[PDB]
Amino acid sequence: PTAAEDLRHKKKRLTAMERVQLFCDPGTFRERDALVEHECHNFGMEKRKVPGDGFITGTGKVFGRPVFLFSHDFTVFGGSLSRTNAAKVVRIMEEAAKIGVPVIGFNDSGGARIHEGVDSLAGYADIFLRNTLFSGVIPQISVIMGPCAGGAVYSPAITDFTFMVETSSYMFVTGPEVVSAVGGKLVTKDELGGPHVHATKSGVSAGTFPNDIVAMAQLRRLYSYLPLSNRDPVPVLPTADERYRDVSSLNTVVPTEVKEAYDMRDVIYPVIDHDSFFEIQPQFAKNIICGFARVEGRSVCIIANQPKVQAGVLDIDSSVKGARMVRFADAFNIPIITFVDVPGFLPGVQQEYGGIIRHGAKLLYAYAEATVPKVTIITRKAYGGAYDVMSSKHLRGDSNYAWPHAEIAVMGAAGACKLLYSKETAEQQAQRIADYEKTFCTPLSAARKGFVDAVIDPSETRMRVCEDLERLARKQLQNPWKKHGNIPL
Amino acid sequence: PTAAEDLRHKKKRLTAMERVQLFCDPGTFRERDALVEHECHNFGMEKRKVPGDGFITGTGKVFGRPVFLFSHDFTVFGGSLSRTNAAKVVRIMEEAAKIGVPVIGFNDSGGARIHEGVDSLAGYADIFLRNTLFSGVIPQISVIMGPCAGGAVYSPAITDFTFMVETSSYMFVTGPEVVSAVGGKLVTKDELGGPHVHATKSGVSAGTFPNDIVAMAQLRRLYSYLPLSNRDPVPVLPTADERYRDVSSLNTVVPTEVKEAYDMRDVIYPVIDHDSFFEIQPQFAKNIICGFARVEGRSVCIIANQPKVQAGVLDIDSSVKGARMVRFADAFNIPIITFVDVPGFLPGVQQEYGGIIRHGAKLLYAYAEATVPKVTIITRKAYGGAYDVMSSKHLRGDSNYAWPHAEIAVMGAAGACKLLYSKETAEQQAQRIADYEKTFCTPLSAARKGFVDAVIDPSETRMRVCEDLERLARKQLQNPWKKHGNIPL
Amino acid sequence: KASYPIIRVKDGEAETVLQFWGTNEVTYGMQMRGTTFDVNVMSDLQSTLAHFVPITEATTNTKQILSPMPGVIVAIKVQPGQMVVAGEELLTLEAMKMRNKIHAQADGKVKEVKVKLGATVEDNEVLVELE
Ligand SMILES: O=CCCCC[C@@H]1SC[C@@H]2NC(=O)N[C@@H]21
Ligand SMILES: O=CCCCC[C@@H]1SC[C@@H]2NC(=O)N[C@@H]21
């Protein structure tokens, strides 16, 4: 019996129920509500009632841990929401708020249902309020499998992570017809809101998958990292890997020349456990890396610069990416580990015309507000305000480390030499820049002041990180009483 | 005796002490620390010690209410910060955190002090952490009277409001010398970070003043609105104006044609008390108005659309502006009053390439998260998701009102008629669009559903607003327990 | 051992040693007799559903290569209008004190005009054109 799904598969596409079956465990899905009708009675809609009413909501179970989910249905009315569709979603989110369980939704709606009038707006508003209230209480993940237009786009935005499917998905606020009507330009749906556009240009989508099957397979892996609720502790899984594994290849990663580049992944991979990195937003703002990883069987958060791309310089997009990652990680009590290599901020008129001052402050706010244990490692250099922003010791950092060839200075040697000698005799470059770099572009001064705990061999990083992260397991820090902060938007 | 200030005034500029004297009451300033030296002992700095060390910090008193402030000094070392300058500021902010008092700072620093090494970075980090921790506890206002470059720019950014002086002030992260070095373009300091640039292009500065004297005079007026701390109640001042003043001119403000424009200030001004509006960011994103005002002697927050500019259409910049205003207003228990007139969102490729999805969600998050009393008035129209965003009744709104000629529909009549009749006989425009607009583009349906409390004459708005704002004085609402939210950055 | 290379397997007397490269949870990168393969391990549902999945073909473009970011060209490696092979460095831009090195991903030859040493122009120009 394979009835009524032949029409769907013929278009090389899967069904909502099949997606739900693929996500959860083999036999642990219990559909909650299945016999519900729209009761519209307008515009010749009194007929063609549907039992499911276009939504599939259940409970399920992943890796032995509970979950909640819902999936849109494209065959029935195009997946449009109504006064009645939104009730099921509201009930699921409320139940997942009472119990410490997350929510995952597979969006496929074609837009609002016009035949209901303003009831669709009512349902949208209720879903928006539930998302707003419960953000930071239970993790929310959203996946977009098909078209997603109109005002329905906003609820995925408030969710913590949004993923996209490559061939047959798109998302935008207004359709290309209106764009043609007002501006006069003919742009296709994919050219407007395709997965690539949101992966590279707008920065909304947190990832892209080639197929639905791969999407489910990796969504399970992502779910294996998250904590169940706000009050539950960070999960710890058994692992045969051990902190005594030898990592001596880190002694040679940093080149002896100051103008040559290297890949920061060569430093990230040895420290964490084998094959346990899940990069977030891999194709957007490549000069910074963010993602999840495990250290001795417990999930941690990774944020590191990359001198491979644009000399590892902070920017607007990198600031937004890092700020969102830090805020989410702190909201759910996940340790943060950072690797620092920054020469400063990206210079240019477009930057000031785009508001670098606002955006660069977001990362600093996220780092200063955080109360989870932090570990910082300075590999090569840290200059100016970039050193302050990237989790400096003064921002209530727990432990800070440096490598023997690091440099921590106010600015580059040339600018310091220029400002320290206004009209000093010519040729001052040769006998002053070298001396200043020798005397003050070294971690000795910063260690004398007390800004780094110790200068360590690069081969001891795994040992030190495991020791510190084990000791810091029970830190309790609290901020002054506030209704909420006022972050620079 | 007018010694040592003749050199300053000759350049048509004022001194820090003169600014402090102008701000506070005639004789209520008590300078806190005045005999402090830098104790540097490097690069020939062992000499030329200064008593004040370039900072003036005190307590003062404005309108009989306490304050705290500090002012940079440009004559002494260019206003550079040090390990010692930042200590005074930290002490002032800590004291103003223990006591429920705000802080106001007049920035004039030329950058960091190179002769101290990384101690300047240490001081910057401490100030950044204090700003981050105490934001949302005590209001913070910052004014920029002169140059402000380097990494020192970030602390004004975290503060709630930043104002600028016209002729002799600028702010940016990196100087034009580096821009010339890397990109090769010659741009002046004013062309890069002048007050106009931040007033119109970047949206960082919240206002601009022509002179320092006017800056102080209006800063006092702004201070008269704010509450003293997080736990203190909203100030109420005596006022001879009364809720029984006749406003019948509102019956004629809205034109009888749907394509003609009008000025929303003609609706804003009658409702509030006379000469009591303080616009915020007047020259940026003119399609939305935000500011402070008084209603029956108590300060409230005003957020309204404007069909004069771009048909009152929501956008990226307007969303950011409104979101920041709502967040600040809610953080300190200030009532919010909104006027709604929106046809939707601005359509265009640049918008999606710039991330409309992220930015438009910020206003919705700010409106949904808020717990202060809200009053909403729909004058003419509200369509699509814009109706949901602008404080709809479903987002825990207290009271909502509409005017007799309003319209609340899913979308415009043309699109609805197109979607409701795919290949219906030609000429369907004339006998379908008119009928649909007549039947469903009216507040009767939204009133039937229960989305507006009542349909009122435009002459009763002041009476209704005063009644509701008086009754709602003691509302107590609380959100679920969270360490903090996760707003879409 | 989990997430490790060596895998010792012994059926009866026969003994084999294979290697485990990596995976994406539907495809396994395993080495057999010093050769890489990608075995697919999927259940009944995944097998019956993988038939109904689009398989798009990636762009096969043999054309000019552009510099991703502005900079300065200080060193060049390849010659104008000769053979080029995959993985060969072509030139090195230096920007904000950093020498990168864009190479040739994959191709057989080129037809183009070289950008001369010290040409501080970049801005996504056509440094090398592949034809
Ligand atoms: O010496 C002239 C250019 C030096 C730029 C050094 C890098 S580029 C971006 C960042 N901003 C700075 O001031 N320094 C770094
Ligand atoms: O009828 C064709 C153009 C109608 C645009 C109506 C305004 S323009 C911006 C906003 N977006 C919409 O979809 N409607 C409004």
Numbering used by the authors:
A (entry chain C), B (entry chain H): 34 to 522
C (entry chain V): 535 to 665
What does the paper say about this structure?
One such multienzyme is propionyl-CoA carboxylase (PCC), which catalyzes the carboxylation of propionyl-CoA to form methylmalonyl-CoA, a precursor to the citric acid cycle intermediate succinyl-CoA. Propionyl-CoA carboxylase (PCC) is a multienzyme complex consisting of up to six α-subunits and six β-subunits. The α-subunit of LtPCC contains three domains: a biotin carboxylase (BC) domain, BC-CT mediating (BT) domain, and biotin carboxyl carrier protein (BCCP) domain. The β-subunit is composed of the structurally homologous N-carboxyltransferase (N-CT) and C-carboxyltransferase (C-CT) domains.
